[PDB]
Design a protein around this ligand. Sequence first.
Ligand code: NA
Ligand code: NA
Lengths: 419, 419
Amino acid sequence: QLQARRLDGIDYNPWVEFVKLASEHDVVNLGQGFPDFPPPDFAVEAFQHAVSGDFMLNQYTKTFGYPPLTKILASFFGELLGQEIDPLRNVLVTVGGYGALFTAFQALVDEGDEVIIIEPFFDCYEPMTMMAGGRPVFVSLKPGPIQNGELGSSSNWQLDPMELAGKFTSRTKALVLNTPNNPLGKVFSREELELVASLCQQHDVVCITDEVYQWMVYDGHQHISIASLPGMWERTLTIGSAGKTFSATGWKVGWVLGPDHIMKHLRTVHQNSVFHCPTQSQAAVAESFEREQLLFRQPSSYFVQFPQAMQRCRDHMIRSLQSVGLKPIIPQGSYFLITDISDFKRKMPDLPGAVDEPYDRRFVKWMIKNKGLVAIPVSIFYSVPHQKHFDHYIRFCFVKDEATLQAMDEKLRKWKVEL
Amino acid sequence: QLQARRLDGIDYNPWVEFVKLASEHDVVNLGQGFPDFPPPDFAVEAFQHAVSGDFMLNQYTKTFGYPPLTKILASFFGELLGQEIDPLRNVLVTVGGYGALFTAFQALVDEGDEVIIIEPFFDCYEPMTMMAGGRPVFVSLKPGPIQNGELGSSSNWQLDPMELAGKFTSRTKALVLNTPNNPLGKVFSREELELVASLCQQHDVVCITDEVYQWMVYDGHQHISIASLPGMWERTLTIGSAGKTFSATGWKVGWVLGPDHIMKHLRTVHQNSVFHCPTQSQAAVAESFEREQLLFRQPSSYFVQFPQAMQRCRDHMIRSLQSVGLKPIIPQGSYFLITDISDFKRKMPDLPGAVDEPYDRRFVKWMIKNKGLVAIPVSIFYSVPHQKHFDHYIRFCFVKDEATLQAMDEKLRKWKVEL
Ligand code: NA
Ligand code: NA
């Protein structure tokens, strides 16, 4: 073959097809995992300032990050983590959370290593492990049993201590923790994080912790960073995303925070891949964090206002989707909620599709074509052997304009009353 | 061990030391490979327009490129290459030329593959080959005969056919071509490209061609793209950089052009690493290319005016550097020229440095600290076994403001009085 063997089995991109099918129908697109409204004015203004300020901002900045950005990341997150963070040794600016994840896998995961992944998982964790020669090892959150009185909560999806412990071996290099979780919206508790911490310390494993949804927490639930737990800083890489923080997904700026003895290897990958991140977006992100640090916990702060606003959008969507028999699982965080479609699988078992195509994928195509609503089938966030079991959930994104939620309700009205 | 074996031998970054030392002294920085004056107005205005326009430009764009950008790249470079280019199948937008190179190496280079690299080489080609499991194989340009008191020319650094042919084996996967070359400023001739093309076809080898300095050509020399030669489109990946095209290195936008059967593998790497490139800089680059396509070959176009202006800066620097006994090699393209320091090595051999330290590295440190001028030791663009033999050149960048060149002359006049 022409191509490298590291690419085996990772060429299929579900997202390219998802975008394709939605674009051919008249839809309310609740599949897109980004806002369809503007970022806050201070963020847009920050980028405007960066592209109209010191003309030298048009030229290269420092390899490991624009210094004013690494300074504020170290200060702001050092406070939150209860850790002294050196900007030069403990911070790397990357091309989004995606680039940060990729850099961590390529630095640490080697042929034969195992990587523990928690289902449902942000889908790239599996192919990134594979491309680095690692063997993914899956542990499944166990859905809470639902009574048809009250809706389930993401919090009730359990990480079984015995099942998790049994996944660790001498070959475990890393465990990937995503909290708040996409697609499920689970916000991991202190007790759950202490379990993960205990096993990572026992087995000398690195925890790669994807915290992009840090600020998107609801119902009084608190984001806890595993790197803040005793002894965890020295074995944790913590990842963030400016796009998910400031509702500006197209900025594609992210970072990794961690101890020098691990970070040095990520710096090695960085300097031998992209070398620099763009200068001006970094300046915009630095200015945006400065604004939020100055207004920390205050009523006008984005980190106070925005999750409150999005909690209302969540509640609106939860009520609306029930009108057609979808069963939401209330998320404690993230942009997302999932709905159980088991009643549809029961009443409408035979949908067109390919052999061994999970029901949810077939259902989403049906719903797009017939009802004009887009969701993402949750089976894409499962290992292939588990897709036959976890085939009855779909993911919706509620971080949407009020007009979009109105349009959703119009589709639901038609679904209920027409034909 | 903690880190992946793919990182072996690639952790050392010479650029961090160079940048650090220069920041610690009063200097005219001719080591920085980027302009110290603004990008052209139309380019800065394009970015301003992108960050103040359609608010949805703040959110994710398409994975393989912002469609207006891939459209104009395909149209414009299609015309330049004499090639029908499909924007969806033949174009990938990347995080600069660096990201483009990285994507190519990770898609195609596998364990045990040989990659032919031409010395002097842009330094990342070697470690990128190594991280992909490849074995770098070096062919060395031969500096031309030092003639009748005249300065050397980059054109006369020869690519010996018998040497090059001897480097091709059944294990050769790719050859990396950089034209115009950094650091040398050589613009490869049609004959030289035909030599490379003939061997790539004979041995069924892919040519990765780094053409970031495409527009920076002088003295009537023409940039020829190897992908435009008969039979080469099907085996060539052509790389460019928006930063080097529009004098905006901090934008970090690049691209790869090539046939689908190769590009599909680069897309696999892309979707499993960064996933998206930032939206708004892509919009700026698209607008900038649209401007230049409309004015193509006209006197008011940047691609005509800018290299003409920079040729004047080149000529100024060539004259000035000779005043202290540095011997420039006249470049036909790129931002750079190199000067022979052999007369200094001979008359001043005993500069402080480590036991094995190439003379040029020692000379640059002495020049920074004592003469107030920064250059880059050319030995960093050689394989380690060859560094002791090519230790007598340093690289200057002439793409500088009038004021900077005046400042250079002030340093040089002070040096001359103390030769
Ligand atoms: Na262990
Ligand atoms: Na061959």
